Amino acid sequence: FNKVTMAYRFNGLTVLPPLLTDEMI
Amino acid sequence: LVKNKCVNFNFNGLTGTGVLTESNKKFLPFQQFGRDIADTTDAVRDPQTLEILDITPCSFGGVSVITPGTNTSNQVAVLYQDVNCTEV
Amino acid sequence: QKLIANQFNSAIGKIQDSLSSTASALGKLQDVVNQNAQALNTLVKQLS
Ligand SMILES: *[C@@H]1O[C@H](CO)[C@@H](O)[C@H](O)[C@H]1NC(C)=O
Ligand SMILES: *[C@@H]1O[C@H](CO)[C@@H](O)[C@H](O)[C@H]1NC(C)=O
Ligand SMILES: *[C@@H]1O[C@H](CO)[C@@H](O)[C@H](O)[C@H]1NC(C)=O
């Protein structure tokens, strides 16, 4: 999780939350 | 000037609609607009008294109607997505 | 068993550094995340 990593939300591109939280995964 | 409340703003000919807040980002003196990776306006400087104001879109998010089958109930629970519960 | 134990454990250890010391192992993931954020940038820049 260290290696991998409203800007687009300003227009309309809304990043929906993945159903399963990482803690569940 | 008003803060933390969605307004439709014009600053020295720059127009935009957002939530103007206080902000800690520090301009260079000659500068005018802060910006972001998208080139979209991000931070501004209040001309009449120099201060660094953020911006922010209104809210948006999609409405979502959570329902049991209309065969069970006619009751629904509305989910406003990706918002804070005030503007409702 | 005892031998296989050590070979296992010492193998697990190097998995840390294999990840710890090189950032390109995760490229597959990293490529997915980038390409998504990529097209979004492109999609945004099309507004201008
Ligand atoms: C605006 O007016 C106030 C006092 O009326 C003054 O202190 C401030 O410097 C003025 N702003 C500019 C940009 O001149
Ligand atoms: C669905 O509603 C119909 C009436 O419109 C009813 O006859 C049926 O039993 C219902 N089925 C379920 C699974 O609720
Ligand atoms: C909602 O606003 C309150 C204060 O107005 C703040 O404490 C909270 O963190 C906010 N939550 C979100 C998700 O913006």
Side-chain angles (χ1 to χ4, degrees), chain B:
Chain B
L1 189 145
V2 183
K3 296 175 180 177
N4 290 336
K5 182 180 78 180
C6 180
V7 299
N8 186 340
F9 58 83
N10 187 342
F11 291 162
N12 297 340
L14 171 67
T15 57
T17 299
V19 175
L20 299 175
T21 70
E22 293 177 350
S23 60
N24 61 345
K25 292 178 178 178
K26 184 178 179 180
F27 287 179
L28 295 176
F30 61 97
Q31 286 168 330
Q32 189 58 58
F33 303 158
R35 287 188 186 274
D36 189 3
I37 306 302
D39 183 65
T40 58
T41 302
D42 175 71
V44 293
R45 184 186 63 196
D46 186 7
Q48 292 183 338
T49 179
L50 303 179
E51 62 185 344
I52 312 304
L53 301 177
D54 277 339
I55 300 171
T56 297
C58 297
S59 294
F60 303 151
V63 178
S64 296
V65 174
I66 296 168
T67 178
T70 60
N71 205 328
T72 299
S73 175
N74 291 338
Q75 186 175 358
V76 299
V78 174
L79 172 66
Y80 293 143
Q81 291 176 335
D82 188 5
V83 296
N84 199 333
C85 296
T86 52
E87 296 83 355
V88 180

Coordinates of all heavy atoms in Angstrom, one line a residue, chain B:
Chain B
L1 N -17.4 39.9 1.2 CA -16.9 38.5 1.0 C -17.4 37.6 2.0 O -17.4 37.9 3.2 CB -15.3 38.6 1.0 CG -14.6 37.3 0.6 CD1 -13.4 37.6 -0.2 CD2 -14.3 36.5 1.8
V2 N -17.7 36.4 1.6 CA -18.3 35.4 2.5 C -17.5 34.1 2.4 O -16.9 33.8 1.3 CB -19.8 35.1 2.2 CG1 -20.4 34.1 3.1 CG2 -20.5 36.4 2.2
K3 N -17.4 33.3 3.4 CA -16.6 32.1 3.5 C -17.4 30.9 3.8 O -18.5 31.0 4.4 CB -15.5 32.3 4.5 CG -14.5 33.4 4.2 CD -13.5 33.6 5.3 CE -12.6 34.7 4.9 NZ -11.6 35.0 6.0
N4 N -16.9 29.7 3.4 CA -17.5 28.4 3.7 C -19.0 28.3 3.3 O -19.7 27.4 3.7 CB -17.4 28.1 5.2 CG -16.0 27.9 5.7 OD1 -15.2 27.5 4.9 ND2 -15.8 28.1 7.0
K5 N -19.4 29.1 2.3 CA -20.8 29.1 1.9 C -20.7 29.3 0.4 O -20.1 30.2 -0.2 CB -21.6 30.2 2.5 CG -23.0 30.3 2.1 CD -23.7 31.4 2.8 CE -23.4 32.7 2.1 NZ -24.2 33.9 2.7
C6 N -21.4 28.3 -0.3 CA -21.3 28.3 -1.8 C -21.8 29.6 -2.4 O -23.0 30.0 -2.1 CB -22.1 27.1 -2.4 SG -22.1 27.1 -4.2
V7 N -21.0 30.3 -3.1 CA -21.3 31.6 -3.7 C -20.9 31.5 -5.2 O -20.3 30.6 -5.6 CB -20.6 32.7 -3.0 CG1 -21.0 32.8 -1.6 CG2 -19.1 32.6 -3.2
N8 N -21.4 32.5 -5.9 CA -21.0 32.6 -7.4 C -20.2 33.8 -7.5 O -20.7 35.0 -7.6 CB -22.3 32.7 -8.2 CG -22.1 32.7 -9.6 OD1 -21.0 32.9 -10.1 ND2 -23.1 32.4 -10.4
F9 N -18.8 33.6 -7.6 CA -17.9 34.7 -7.3 C -17.3 35.3 -8.6 O -17.1 34.6 -9.6 CB -16.8 34.3 -6.4 CG -16.0 33.1 -6.9 CD1 -15.0 33.3 -7.8 CD2 -16.3 31.8 -6.5 CE1 -14.3 32.2 -8.3 CE2 -15.6 30.8 -6.9 CZ -14.6 31.0 -7.8
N10 N -17.0 36.6 -8.6 CA -16.2 37.2 -9.6 C -15.1 38.0 -8.9 O -15.3 38.9 -8.1 CB -17.0 38.2 -10.5 CG -16.2 38.7 -11.6 OD1 -15.0 38.7 -11.6 ND2 -16.9 39.3 -12.6
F11 N -13.8 37.6 -9.2 CA -12.6 38.3 -8.6 C -11.9 38.9 -9.8 O -11.3 38.2 -10.6 CB -11.8 37.3 -7.9 CG -12.4 36.8 -6.6 CD1 -11.9 35.7 -6.0 CD2 -13.4 37.5 -6.0 CE1 -12.4 35.2 -4.8 CE2 -13.9 37.0 -4.8 CZ -13.5 35.9 -4.2
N12 N -11.8 40.2 -9.8 CA -11.1 41.0 -10.8 C -11.3 40.5 -12.2 O -10.3 40.2 -12.9 CB -9.6 41.0 -10.4 CG -9.3 41.7 -9.1 OD1 -10.1 42.5 -8.6 ND2 -8.1 41.3 -8.5
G13 N -12.5 40.2 -12.5 CA -12.9 39.6 -13.8 C -12.9 38.1 -13.9 O -13.5 37.5 -14.7
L14 N -12.2 37.5 -12.9 CA -12.3 36.0 -12.8 C -13.6 35.6 -12.3 O -13.9 36.0 -11.1 CB -11.1 35.5 -12.0 CG -11.4 34.0 -11.7 CD1 -11.3 33.2 -13.0 CD2 -10.5 33.4 -10.7
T15 N -14.4 34.8 -13.0 CA -15.6 34.3 -12.5 C -15.6 32.8 -12.2 O -14.8 32.1 -12.8 CB -16.7 34.6 -13.6 OG1 -16.4 33.9 -14.8 CG2 -17.0 36.0 -13.8
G16 N -16.3 32.4 -11.2 CA -16.4 31.1 -10.8 C -17.4 30.9 -9.7 O -17.8 31.9 -9.1
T17 N -17.8 29.7 -9.5 CA -18.8 29.3 -8.4 C -18.2 28.2 -7.6 O -18.0 27.1 -8.1 CB -20.1 28.9 -9.0 OG1 -20.7 30.0 -9.8 CG2 -21.1 28.6 -7.9
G18 N -18.0 28.5 -6.3 CA -17.4 27.5 -5.4 C -17.6 27.9 -4.0 O -18.4 28.8 -3.7
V19 N -16.9 27.2 -3.1 CA -17.0 27.4 -1.7 C -15.7 28.1 -1.3 O -14.6 27.5 -1.3 CB -17.1 26.1 -0.9 CG1 -17.0 26.4 0.6 CG2 -18.5 25.5 -1.2
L20 N -15.7 29.4 -1.0 CA -14.5 30.2 -0.7 C -14.2 30.0 0.7 O -15.0 30.2 1.6 CB -14.8 31.6 -1.1 CG -15.1 31.8 -2.5 CD1 -15.5 33.3 -2.8 CD2 -13.9 31.4 -3.4
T21 N -13.0 29.6 1.0 CA -12.5 29.3 2.3 C -11.2 30.0 2.6 O -10.5 30.5 1.7 CB -12.4 27.8 2.6 OG1 -11.2 27.3 1.9 CG2 -13.6 27.0 2.1
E22 N -10.8 30.0 3.8 CA -9.4 30.4 4.1 C -8.5 29.3 3.7 O -8.9 28.1 3.7 CB -9.2 30.7 5.6 CG -10.0 31.9 6.1 CD -9.8 32.1 7.6 OE1 -9.3 31.2 8.3 OE2 -10.2 33.2 8.1
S23 N -7.2 29.6 3.4 CA -6.3 28.6 2.9 C -4.9 29.0 3.3 O -4.6 30.2 3.4 CB -6.4 28.4 1.4 OG -6.1 29.7 0.7
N24 N -4.1 28.0 3.5 CA -2.7 28.2 4.0 C -1.7 28.3 2.8 O -0.5 28.7 3.1 CB -2.3 27.1 4.9 CG -2.4 25.8 4.3 OD1 -3.0 25.6 3.2 ND2 -1.7 24.8 4.9
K25 N -2.1 27.9 1.6 CA -1.1 28.0 0.5 C -0.7 29.4 0.2 O -1.5 30.3 0.3 CB -1.7 27.4 -0.8 CG -2.0 25.9 -0.6 CD -2.6 25.3 -1.9 CE -2.8 23.8 -1.8 NZ -3.5 23.2 -3.0
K26 N 0.6 29.6 0.0 CA 1.2 30.9 0.0 C 1.7 31.3 -1.4 O 2.5 30.7 -2.0 CB 2.4 30.9 1.0 CG 3.0 32.2 1.2 CD 4.1 32.1 2.2 CE 4.8 33.5 2.4 NZ 5.9 33.3 3.4
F27 N 1.1 32.4 -2.0 CA 1.4 32.8 -3.3 C 2.8 33.5 -3.3 O 3.3 33.9 -2.3 CB 0.4 33.8 -3.9 CG -0.9 33.2 -4.3 CD1 -1.9 34.0 -4.8 CD2 -1.0 31.8 -4.3 CE1 -3.0 33.4 -5.2 CE2 -2.2 31.3 -4.7 CZ -3.2 32.1 -5.2
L28 N 3.3 33.7 -4.5 CA 4.3 34.7 -4.8 C 3.5 36.0 -5.0 O 2.4 36.0 -5.5 CB 5.1 34.4 -6.0 CG 6.0 33.2 -5.8 CD1 6.7 32.9 -7.1 CD2 7.0 33.4 -4.7
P29 N 4.1 37.1 -4.6 CA 3.4 38.4 -4.5 C 2.8 38.8 -5.9 O 1.6 39.3 -5.9 CB 4.5 39.4 -4.1 CG 5.4 38.6 -3.2 CD 5.4 37.2 -3.9
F30 N 3.5 38.7 -7.0 CA 3.0 39.2 -8.2 C 1.9 38.3 -8.8 O 1.1 38.8 -9.7 CB 4.1 39.3 -9.3 CG 4.8 37.9 -9.5 CD1 4.4 37.2 -10.6 CD2 5.7 37.4 -8.6 CE1 5.0 36.0 -10.9 CE2 6.3 36.2 -8.9 CZ 5.9 35.5 -10.0
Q31 N 1.7 37.1 -8.3 CA 0.8 36.1 -8.9 C -0.6 36.5 -8.7 O -1.0 37.4 -7.9 CB 1.1 34.8 -8.2 CG 2.3 34.1 -8.7 CD 2.7 32.9 -7.8 OE1 2.4 32.9 -6.6 NE2 3.3 31.9 -8.4
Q32 N -1.5 35.9 -9.5 CA -2.9 36.1 -9.4 C -3.7 34.8 -9.0 O -4.1 34.6 -7.9 CB -3.4 36.7 -10.7 CG -4.9 37.1 -10.6 CD -5.0 38.1 -9.5 OE1 -4.4 39.2 -9.5 NE2 -5.8 37.8 -8.5
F33 N -3.8 33.9 -9.9 CA -4.5 32.6 -9.7 C -3.6 31.5 -9.2 O -2.6 31.3 -9.8 CB -5.2 32.1 -11.0 CG -6.1 33.1 -11.6 CD1 -6.4 33.0 -12.9 CD2 -6.7 34.2 -10.9 CE1 -7.3 33.9 -13.5 CE2 -7.5 35.1 -11.4 CZ -7.8 35.0 -12.8
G34 N -4.0 30.8 -8.2 CA -3.6 29.5 -8.0 C -4.3 28.5 -8.9 O -5.4 28.8 -9.4
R35 N -3.7 27.4 -9.2 CA -4.3 26.4 -10.1 C -3.9 25.0 -9.6 O -3.3 24.9 -8.5 CB -3.9 26.6 -11.6 CG -4.6 27.7 -12.3 CD -4.3 27.6 -13.8 NE -4.7 28.8 -14.5 CZ -5.9 28.9 -15.0 NH1 -6.8 28.0 -14.8 NH2 -6.2 30.0 -15.7
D36 N -4.3 24.1 -10.4 CA -4.3 22.7 -10.0 C -3.8 21.9 -11.2 O -3.6 22.4 -12.3 CB -5.6 22.2 -9.5 CG -5.6 20.8 -8.9 OD1 -4.5 20.3 -8.8 OD2 -6.7 20.3 -8.5
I37 N -3.7 20.6 -11.1 CA -3.2 19.7 -12.2 C -4.1 19.8 -13.4 O -3.6 19.7 -14.5 CB -3.1 18.3 -11.7 CG1 -2.3 18.2 -10.4 CG2 -2.5 17.4 -12.7 CD1 -0.9 18.7 -10.5
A38 N -5.4 20.1 -13.2 CA -6.3 20.1 -14.3 C -6.4 21.5 -14.9 O -7.2 21.7 -15.8 CB -7.7 19.7 -13.8
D39 N -5.5 22.5 -14.5 CA -5.5 23.9 -14.9 C -6.8 24.6 -14.4 O -6.9 25.8 -14.5 CB -5.5 23.9 -16.5 CG -5.4 25.4 -17.0 OD1 -4.4 26.1 -16.7 OD2 -6.3 25.8 -17.7
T40 N -7.7 23.8 -13.8 CA -8.9 24.4 -13.2 C -8.4 25.4 -12.1 O -7.5 25.1 -11.3 CB -9.7 23.3 -12.6 OG1 -9.0 22.5 -11.7 CG2 -10.2 22.4 -13.7
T41 N -9.2 26.5 -11.9 CA -8.9 27.4 -10.9 C -9.0 26.7 -9.5 O -10.0 26.0 -9.3 CB -9.9 28.6 -11.0 OG1 -9.8 29.2 -12.3 CG2 -9.6 29.6 -9.9
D42 N -8.0 27.0 -8.7 CA -8.1 26.4 -7.3 C -8.0 27.4 -6.2 O -9.0 27.5 -5.5 CB -6.9 25.4 -7.2 CG -6.8 24.9 -5.8 OD1 -7.6 24.0 -5.4 OD2 -5.9 25.3 -5.0
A43 N -7.0 28.1 -6.1 CA -6.8 29.2 -5.1 C -6.8 30.5 -5.8 O -6.4 30.7 -6.9 CB -5.6 29.0 -4.3
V44 N -7.3 31.5 -5.0 CA -7.3 32.9 -5.5 C -6.9 33.8 -4.4 O -6.8 33.4 -3.2 CB -8.7 33.3 -6.0 CG1 -9.1 32.6 -7.3 CG2 -9.7 33.1 -4.9
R45 N -6.6 35.1 -4.8 CA -6.1 36.1 -3.9 C -7.1 37.2 -3.9 O -7.4 37.8 -4.9 CB -4.7 36.6 -4.2 CG -4.1 37.6 -3.3 CD -2.8 38.1 -3.8 NE -3.1 38.8 -5.0 CZ -2.1 39.1 -5.9 NH1 -0.9 38.8 -5.7 NH2 -2.5 39.8 -7.0
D46 N -7.6 37.5 -2.7 CA -8.6 38.6 -2.6 C -7.9 39.9 -2.9 O -7.0 40.3 -2.1 CB -9.3 38.6 -1.2 CG -10.4 39.6 -1.1 OD1 -10.8 40.2 -2.1 OD2 -10.9 39.8 0.0
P47 N -8.3 40.6 -3.9 CA -7.6 41.9 -4.2 C -7.7 42.9 -3.1 O -6.7 43.5 -2.8 CB -8.2 42.3 -5.5 CG -9.5 41.6 -5.6 CD -9.3 40.3 -5.0
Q48 N -8.9 43.2 -2.6 CA -9.0 44.4 -1.7 C -8.2 44.2 -0.4 O -7.7 45.2 0.1 CB -10.5 44.6 -1.4 CG -11.3 45.1 -2.6 CD -12.7 45.5 -2.2 OE1 -13.3 45.0 -1.2 NE2 -13.3 46.3 -3.1
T49 N -8.1 43.0 0.1 CA -7.2 42.6 1.1 C -6.6 41.3 0.7 O -7.3 40.3 0.5 CB -7.8 42.6 2.5 OG1 -6.8 42.2 3.4 CG2 -9.0 41.6 2.6
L50 N -5.2 41.3 0.6 CA -4.6 40.1 0.0 C -4.8 38.9 1.0 O -4.3 39.0 2.1 CB -3.1 40.4 -0.3 CG -2.9 41.6 -1.2 CD1 -1.4 41.8 -1.4 CD2 -3.6 41.4 -2.5
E51 N -5.5 37.9 0.5 CA -5.6 36.7 1.3 C -5.9 35.6 0.3 O -6.4 35.8 -0.8 CB -6.8 36.8 2.3 CG -8.1 37.0 1.7 CD -9.2 37.2 2.7 OE1 -9.0 37.0 3.9 OE2 -10.3 37.7 2.3
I52 N -5.5 34.4 0.7 CA -5.4 33.2 -0.2 C -6.7 32.4 0.1 O -6.8 31.7 1.1 CB -4.2 32.4 0.0 CG1 -3.0 33.3 0.0 CG2 -4.0 31.5 -1.2 CD1 -2.9 34.2 -1.3
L53 N -7.6 32.4 -0.9 CA -8.9 31.7 -0.7 C -8.8 30.5 -1.6 O -8.4 30.5 -2.7 CB -10.0 32.6 -1.2 CG -10.2 33.9 -0.5 CD1 -11.3 34.8 -1.1 CD2 -10.4 33.7 1.0
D54 N -9.2 29.3 -1.0 CA -9.4 28.2 -1.8 C -10.7 28.3 -2.6 O -11.4 29.3 -2.5 CB -9.5 26.9 -0.9 CG -8.2 26.4 -0.5 OD1 -7.2 26.7 -1.2 OD2 -8.1 25.6 0.5
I55 N -10.9 27.3 -3.4 CA -12.2 27.0 -4.1 C -12.5 25.6 -4.0 O -11.7 24.8 -3.4 CB -12.1 27.5 -5.6 CG1 -11.8 29.0 -5.6 CG2 -13.5 27.4 -6.3 CD1 -11.5 29.5 -7.0
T56 N -13.7 25.1 -4.4 CA -14.3 23.8 -4.2 C -15.5 23.8 -5.0 O -16.3 24.8 -5.0 CB -14.5 23.6 -2.7 OG1 -13.3 23.6 -2.0 CG2 -15.2 22.3 -2.5
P57 N -15.8 22.7 -5.7 CA -17.1 22.6 -6.4 C -18.3 22.7 -5.4 O -18.1 22.7 -4.2 CB -17.0 21.3 -7.2 CG -16.2 20.5 -6.3 CD -15.2 21.4 -5.7
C58 N -19.5 22.7 -6.0 CA -20.6 22.8 -5.1 C -20.7 21.6 -4.1 O -20.2 21.7 -3.0 CB -21.9 23.0 -5.8 SG -22.0 24.5 -6.8
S59 N -21.3 20.6 -4.6 CA -21.2 19.3 -3.9 C -21.3 18.1 -4.9 O -20.3 17.4 -5.1 CB -22.4 19.1 -2.9 OG -22.2 20.1 -1.8
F60 N -22.4 18.0 -5.6 CA -22.8 17.0 -6.5 C -22.9 15.6 -5.8 O -23.5 15.6 -4.7 CB -21.8 17.0 -7.7 CG -21.7 18.3 -8.3 CD1 -20.5 18.6 -8.9 CD2 -22.8 19.2 -8.3 CE1 -20.4 19.9 -9.5 CE2 -22.6 20.4 -8.9 CZ -21.5 20.7 -9.5
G61 N -22.4 14.6 -6.4 CA -22.8 13.2 -6.0 C -24.1 12.9 -6.6 O -24.9 13.8 -7.0
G62 N -24.3 11.6 -6.9 CA -25.6 11.2 -7.4 C -26.6 10.8 -6.3 O -26.2 10.4 -5.3
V63 N -27.8 11.0 -6.6 CA -28.9 10.5 -5.8 C -29.0 9.0 -6.0 O -28.9 8.5 -7.1 CB -30.2 11.3 -6.0 CG1 -31.3 10.7 -5.1 CG2 -30.0 12.7 -5.8
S64 N -29.3 8.3 -5.0 CA -29.5 6.8 -5.1 C -30.6 6.4 -4.2 O -30.7 6.8 -3.0 CB -28.2 6.1 -4.7 OG -27.2 6.4 -5.5
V65 N -31.6 5.7 -4.8 CA -32.8 5.3 -4.1 C -32.6 3.9 -3.7 O -32.7 3.0 -4.5 CB -34.1 5.5 -4.9 CG1 -35.2 4.9 -4.2 CG2 -34.3 7.0 -5.2
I66 N -32.4 3.6 -2.4 CA -32.3 2.3 -1.9 C -33.7 1.8 -1.6 O -34.4 2.4 -0.7 CB -31.4 2.3 -0.6 CG1 -30.0 2.7 -0.9 CG2 -31.5 0.9 0.0 CD1 -29.2 2.9 0.3
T67 N -34.1 0.7 -2.2 CA -35.4 0.2 -1.9 C -35.4 -1.3 -1.8 O -34.8 -2.0 -2.6 CB -36.4 0.7 -3.0 OG1 -37.7 0.1 -2.7 CG2 -36.0 0.2 -4.3
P68 N -36.2 -1.8 -0.8 CA -36.7 -3.2 -1.0 C -37.7 -3.2 -2.2 O -38.1 -2.1 -2.7 CB -37.5 -3.4 0.3 CG -37.8 -2.0 0.8 CD -36.7 -1.2 0.4
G69 N -37.9 -4.4 -2.7 CA -38.8 -4.5 -3.8 C -40.1 -3.7 -3.6 O -40.7 -3.8 -2.5
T70 N -40.6 -3.1 -4.6 CA -42.0 -2.4 -4.5 C -43.0 -3.5 -4.1 O -44.1 -3.1 -3.7 CB -42.3 -1.7 -5.7 OG1 -42.4 -2.7 -6.8 CG2 -41.3 -0.7 -6.1
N71 N -42.7 -4.8 -4.2 CA -43.6 -5.8 -3.8 C -43.6 -5.9 -2.2 O -44.7 -6.1 -1.7 CB -43.2 -7.1 -4.3 CG -44.3 -8.1 -4.4 OD1 -45.2 -8.1 -3.6 ND2 -44.2 -8.9 -5.5
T72 N -42.5 -5.6 -1.6 CA -42.5 -5.6 -0.1 C -43.0 -4.2 0.4 O -44.0 -4.2 1.1 CB -41.1 -5.8 0.4 OG1 -40.6 -7.1 0.0 CG2 -41.0 -5.7 1.9
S73 N -42.3 -3.1 0.1 CA -42.7 -1.8 0.6 C -42.7 -0.8 -0.5 O -42.1 -1.0 -1.5 CB -41.7 -1.4 1.7 OG -42.0 -0.1 2.1
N74 N -43.4 0.3 -0.2 CA -43.3 1.5 -1.0 C -42.3 2.5 -0.3 O -42.2 3.6 -0.8 CB -44.6 2.2 -1.2 CG -45.5 1.4 -2.1 OD1 -45.0 0.6 -2.9 ND2 -46.8 1.6 -2.0
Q75 N -41.7 2.1 0.8 CA -40.8 3.0 1.5 C -39.4 2.9 0.9 O -39.0 1.8 0.5 CB -40.7 2.6 3.0 CG -39.9 3.6 3.8 CD -40.0 3.2 5.3 OE1 -40.7 2.3 5.6 NE2 -39.3 4.0 6.1
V76 N -38.7 4.0 0.8 CA -37.4 4.1 0.2 C -36.5 4.9 1.1 O -36.9 5.8 1.8 CB -37.3 4.6 -1.2 CG1 -38.2 3.8 -2.1 CG2 -37.8 6.1 -1.2
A77 N -35.2 4.5 1.1 CA -34.2 5.3 1.8 C -33.2 5.9 0.7 O -32.6 5.2 0.0 CB -33.4 4.4 2.8
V78 N -33.1 7.2 0.7 CA -32.4 8.0 -0.3 C -30.9 8.1 0.2 O -30.7 8.5 1.4 CB -33.0 9.4 -0.5 CG1 -32.0 10.2 -1.4 CG2 -34.3 9.2 -1.1
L79 N -30.0 7.7 -0.6 CA -28.6 8.0 -0.4 C -28.1 9.1 -1.3 O -28.1 9.0 -2.5 CB -27.7 6.7 -0.7 CG -26.3 7.1 -0.6 CD1 -25.9 7.5 0.8 CD2 -25.4 6.0 -1.1
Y80 N -27.7 10.2 -0.6 CA -27.0 11.3 -1.3 C -25.5 10.9 -1.3 O -24.9 10.7 -0.2 CB -27.2 12.6 -0.7 CG -28.6 13.1 -0.8 CD1 -29.1 13.9 0.2 CD2 -29.3 12.9 -2.0 CE1 -30.4 14.3 0.1 CE2 -30.5 13.4 -2.1 CZ -31.1 14.1 -1.1 OH -32.4 14.6 -1.2
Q81 N -24.9 10.7 -2.5 CA -23.5 10.2 -2.6 C -22.5 11.3 -2.4 O -22.6 12.3 -3.0 CB -23.3 9.4 -3.9 CG -24.1 8.2 -4.0 CD -23.9 7.5 -5.4 OE1 -23.6 8.2 -6.3 NE2 -24.1 6.2 -5.4
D82 N -21.5 11.0 -1.6 CA -20.3 11.8 -1.5 C -20.6 13.3 -1.2 O -20.3 14.2 -1.9 CB -19.5 11.7 -2.8 CG -18.1 12.4 -2.8 OD1 -17.8 12.9 -1.7 OD2 -17.5 12.5 -3.8
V83 N -21.4 13.5 -0.1 CA -21.7 14.8 0.4 C -21.6 14.8 1.9 O -21.5 13.7 2.5 CB -23.1 15.3 -0.1 CG1 -23.2 15.4 -1.6 CG2 -24.1 14.4 0.4
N84 N -21.6 16.0 2.4 CA -21.7 16.1 3.9 C -23.2 16.5 4.2 O -23.8 17.2 3.4 CB -20.8 17.2 4.3 CG -20.5 17.2 5.8 OD1 -21.3 16.7 6.6 ND2 -19.3 17.6 6.2
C85 N -23.7 16.0 5.3 CA -25.1 16.3 5.5 C -25.3 17.6 6.1 O -25.2 17.8 7.3 CB -25.7 15.2 6.5 SG -25.7 13.5 6.0
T86 N -25.5 18.6 5.2 CA -26.0 19.9 5.6 C -26.9 20.4 4.5 O -28.1 20.5 4.7 CB -24.8 20.9 5.7 OG1 -24.0 20.8 4.5 CG2 -24.0 20.6 6.9
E87 N -26.4 20.5 3.2 CA -27.1 21.1 2.1 C -28.4 20.4 1.8 O -29.2 20.9 1.0 CB -26.2 21.1 0.9 CG -25.0 22.0 1.0 CD -23.9 21.2 1.7 OE1 -24.1 20.1 2.2 OE2 -22.8 21.8 1.8
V88 N -28.7 19.2 2.3 CA -30.0 18.6 2.1 C -31.1 19.5 2.5 O -31.8 20.1 1.7 CB -30.0 17.3 3.0 CG1 -31.3 16.6 2.8 CG2 -28.8 16.4 2.6

